[PDB]
């Protein structure tokens, strides 16, 4: 009952208008050789949105290691935009960095599939992960009650990376898998003689010759997607709303 | 694109086969007053697949506790679906408590919008959280070279169902929001007079009277939500490999 | 092109969100007894704009004396409004005291034909003039760049008001038409023997059979008219800039 | 409901049949640099349309300042509008110096969105204010029972070309305006670093990045606007019908 | 009903992953000179469909030194297929050498019309006999319920590919007609002059002009032939359950 | 490129006009308590076609023990039928003793499906088992150029008979399968509940929880399907040409 | 109701299978300059089709002599035609030389419009006689029940090329019509002055302007077709079921 | 190509105006039992025509004897019609005594799909014989340059009423058929076992089971109908023209 794009799919070529000004999606990032993560939220000036908007903003940083853009959109106006990060950056004291897209009207929602059933006028909170083909690498879709989990957000940028630059797959919970920890899994074999041969061959640690995995990923990538599970697993030192 | 369910929408519904019977959904979960997360995987006897199975079966007990279901789907048939948890059993040691949808033809797949542009013939790694009303919560979609973080959806269930009943929204990161912490939100007032009555009251802490909040979940259920993150973030002890 | 509601039809029945709430229209106005003026500007913390709700805030008691409720519509959020309120009072210190539709996705927009050629995402400066039956009785169509004059909008509503109740049409820049100055008109003679018989009974002031008029206004109804007028033509010797 | 022509549209190219004979819009007024009103009245030998034709008349050297021409527009033959402006000048002493528009059947009208509700035989008191490239800026729908406020056509015309001249947005009530008087407003910014840009600069009176304005007209330009709005507002010295 | 390819129709242009890898029907049967039998099962790790597979392991040989390839299909992946080898060559002792499609989605079953009303999800037990110009020359359709007899396979390719040569019909129960026994049958007359001239010559063997024989295969062909259905008939010596 | 009816649907519903006389398909077998075999051939007065009657009747007394009934089919009419019979009985010495149904202009063999690329005039070799209930349980295109094997057709029937009688599947070859002889095949367990309890009560012979089967069939039954194999294999002791 | 070709028309082109083989109609007559008769019959091996062939045969030699040729057509196979033959030549011993189109499908029947209500799965009796040129001249529709009478289609050929050959129109019964006998009818005139010149020629025998005519045909050829009708009203004086 | 009715098919119901009045078809007749032979001809006051209407005309008391009306059609008036029937009778002596139906507007000729490719305004020479159940039981079409044989309409009206009232089929030139001459034939067995019945009786003479005749006719129907083709044949007495 909805329509949206899909995993393996070109990101919608459109123009949109951001509050740091007009630009061409997925081109303005691809053009760049840069990933981005663009989200939505449903309102400027709503509590679990600016939550959100302080919450990437922290993390900000991280993104920029990883060599991912920001970038956030609502149905809002570039006025409300830009006034809304005026209040924030003066009450809570974070200045958020990153473009927001302007979509009155909702035609970048519609092509994008944010409209759900809960609401009419607002977009959910939507997140689209864009490699730098442009190609759609993972999306997820909270509702305006429940803010996301922004390091999850990280850890699979991070992975997504990471796997692509060592042709490998991330187990579950990766890098704390259950089973293999930080190992990551060969692509299983595809036909019996691949089969055959990749047993035959002793290379690598295995549980059947569908189950093959090594340990290919630095230290530095094991330890830093670790940091981020660290971090939205402490209890925070010094709450924001104190000062 | 592809055709989705949405967010807010009744789950669709269907028969289905799984390799615990026929059941329809989401009937069959609603009529027990279960959530349930129903989750795909692109094939049975691959590598990441199974982890993401053991993770599931590792936090059964978990989503039980919250009364949350679990059920699993790929295109492969019951047969495959018995054998892959014989081999789990006998070479993991974990056995796979909860169901999976056998759903060779993808009729199932088609309706979830669960065939994307990865592959002709296998599922993405689609997760739908639906409450015990039958309606769709939260929708994750994860690709076939990538695991999915299991402590996550525990969060998202466990922060949706104290939201409802707190009448709460929610903050980034909950329960270790930078802002306001484990607090919860008050839904934001829509008109002008609310708006001014709220503040005027002075019953909440506030940044102005659309961002007010509290801190009315128990100490067990913030201390709960930590836990699925904590364990997210801890190297295991032991590897199930050795 | 596109499709507007047109005069003498019955204004759009709508359920509408707005900032004192959610109401339908024109029900909300029709069982009351009220008129009511719902216009349209672009955006929310924009300049013209803000100096529309202004005027029209500090005329709301010339229009509340007629009957006639104030009504305003963007494609802003209710948080938006709420918001731009709060900065029109705290800044111009001025209390915009009527509703404000919020039309997030353009609905109520589209329905009304509201988005013209200038911007595909905001909506043009409109007015419409709905009576007490909950019909359109005139449309004004300003654009983004030109800021409408209120005492028009307040002369119209007078005018037609008086025109319904005195049955009788009002003419060209009444009350200081340069013919017939604060004079009524007859509706014309639609029949020849009507047209001689209005001719035969000498009850009019008249040009020829179909311009007949006479001067059924009160003192106190023309005085209110012309001092509409004189506030336009009146430059205000306190500018709210200054304070 | 009806279709409309639209504000930034280019005015509809079509051939039309006036007491002055045959024209094409825009194209007779966009070659030679001028701007035109075009209005519309229900008919003929009707009095509140008389008023009017005489309002404009007596505004037309006003019009012709700015480098606007005016064109009326009914249902009435050529025969009747050349009858109606005779019986104009004998009776009332005001020659009508503009082309009216003859259209018979409503093509034309229909074309503009002219025909409404309140009557299926006669069109509204439509005006279209349209520029020297042929595009539509303003558009007025008044209705049968109730005469227009000509003086406010001529502020609008005469507001729209200090904005296009000025790049400049015009306040409401201009020149008379309860905020900023006769001050008229810069476009405000588009981007965050523009509005910061804005500020920094210090260049404009100002009560937030977003409203900022000077006074860039002439006093001439200001007191012309003035004057249309004090005629408005002045009862009349002497009435034609004595 | 549903829609199948037809005899004497080119087999359906298509490419196929196998557990072999991906190739092209019928290009790559066709472009060896190679006939094949395409033949589709319902589900790997089922018990009729592992009694067929050993069947025609059994008889691969046989259809080689025809110039025969064999191809499987059923909607499972292509890791069940792989598991599901494994499994026969272990437990069973005999390893299956010949590739089986991998169809989960059922796109390659569709165009086949594998999908009939018994299930909605499975395939039936297809077979197509597809000659050496790519041409589908025989279709047979099995149920669930019930294996098909690997022999008769045999003596159809057989039979076809001799009258194919000879230029000769093929009586019922070849080589064991009980009318003509081994004889094979000269494509009867379509006129009457040629019927007339058929007669005149003497030349075959005859009940009636549109009945003539002859019995132009070889010893070797006919045993073969014979030794195909000798073998169908002849209890094994030692089953392999033991 | 064609329709045909599908196995596991009733045969579909027909009036059709036989060289016996009317009768209604699947009716006229379903109210009997029979399975019927009807089978199709291009044309009466053809070599191919002929050899399988004459090997149809030798095997209806088969037929006939088992509860089959047997029914052709052909574009021919019903003139055409009966003059090839009187041919068959005169020069073969073999009363064809079943029905064929008439179709000339094909509507019948439209609804089966059984007019294909060899021919746009006559129909292949098609075989439809259809039992008692009137479903359709196994389907056969020949082709003009290539005869029946008609033991095999008994094999089919038999089987299916057996099977649905003793609630087994049949294995390949039976009753000469080369892994359980004449064995027949619990079919196997759906869910995993019903497998481990399969397993515990250790009631049948098995390979694996999927594969398990026993030995239900009489020696009556087994011997009569593996005599229909026999039969098949047999060198003819004297050819009905000569005789 | 059902859709036929129609007399003027082109008859349609196609290739038809008969026991004599594959031939594409209208052309095979048409390249040799021949009319031809096709006819339909709903079974072979039913008497009332047996007595028509037989009919046809025993005619045949009158259609050749008028450079006419013969084609039946039913929705049987060639193998039945080939049968039937045999058994009309054997039993009744008469050979049948002409072909027939084998149609099962109905294929060529649908096309000619000669499946009726009378029977969803035989043709009816159906004529169609076509011209050297390919054209359909006439069409008879006879039933089941129903055999022809064969004289007739001769009588038809023969006066549709003399009318052809003398630019004439053919009177009812020709050549024993009751007003003008053997006859011919000058086609009337469609104007006014054509009328008012034939009048005034005083060329013709004439009733009136729009009815003049002459006797341009040979005594041969009235002859022919009088032996045609004199045959078709004489009792043969032995039948052909007395010496099986 | 053209529609037309069909034999087999009730005669198309329609009311028609004729010369004698306005009648309803196939009901005026079916009403009295009477069989009806409606025929076209292209335009009165043409020369074929005119000698057809004569010869049906002398043959009127031959089809009465039968409960046979004729009823003619073109798309000429009723004026026409009655202006050509008393040409005809001043002219040549006869009387036409059956209606003509007038179809101006070719409503009629379109619905019996008399208007074929020789003409565009004027109907074939069609013949539609109708049996007093109202159908339809034989058609025939001649051209506008050959006019019809009508003994041979006489001879199919008795034949088929022959045919009906025996329960016999009629052969070829009946009832002078070469083969059973003023034998009527059996309609054929249907099914082996009547086949083999009706040659066990030996009821019939016979040349085989599907040919088998009697004599039912009586001298009187046999003499009759042969009577209508001696006429044809004969060279008339004295000619009308004369
Ligand atoms: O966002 O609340
Ligand atoms: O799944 O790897
Ligand atoms: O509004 O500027
Ligand atoms: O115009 O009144
Ligand atoms: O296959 O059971
Ligand atoms: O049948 O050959
Ligand atoms: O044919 O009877
Ligand atoms: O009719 O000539």
Redesign the pocket.
């Given at each position: 009952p909805g329509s949206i794009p899909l995993i393996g799919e070109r990101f919608p070529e459109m123009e949109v208008t951001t509050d740091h000004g007009v630009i061409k999606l997925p081109d303005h990032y691809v053009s760049q050789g840069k990933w981005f993560v663009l989200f939505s939220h449903?309102?400027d000036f709503?509590?679990?949105?600016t939550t959100e908007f302080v919450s990437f903003a922290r993390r900000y940083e991280d993104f920029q290691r990883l060599g991912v853009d920001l970038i956030g959109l609502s149905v809002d106006s570039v006025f409300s935009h830009i006034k809304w990060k005026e209040w924030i950056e003066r009450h809570i004291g974070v200045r958020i960095p990153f473009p927001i897209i302007a979509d009155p009207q909702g035609t970048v929602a519609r092509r994008l599939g944010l409209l759900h059933a809960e609401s009419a006028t607002h977009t959910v909170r939507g997140v689209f992960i864009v490699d730098a083909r442009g190609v759609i690498r993972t999306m997820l879709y909270y509702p305006?009650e429940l803010g996301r989990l922004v390091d999850e957000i990280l850890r699979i940028v991070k992975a997504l990376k990471l796997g692509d630059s060592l042709k490998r797959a991330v187990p579950a919970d990766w890098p704390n898998n259950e089973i293999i920890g930080e190992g990551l899994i060969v692509p299983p074999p595809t036909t019996e003689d691949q089969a055959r041969a990749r047993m035959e061959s002793g290379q690598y640690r295995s549980l059947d010759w569908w189950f093959c995995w090594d340990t290919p990923a630095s230290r530095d990538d094991v330890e830093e997607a670790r940091r981020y599970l660290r971090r939205a697993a402490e209890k925070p030192a010094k709450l924001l709303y104190e000062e």
């Open positions: 449903p309102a709503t509590p679990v949105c305006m």
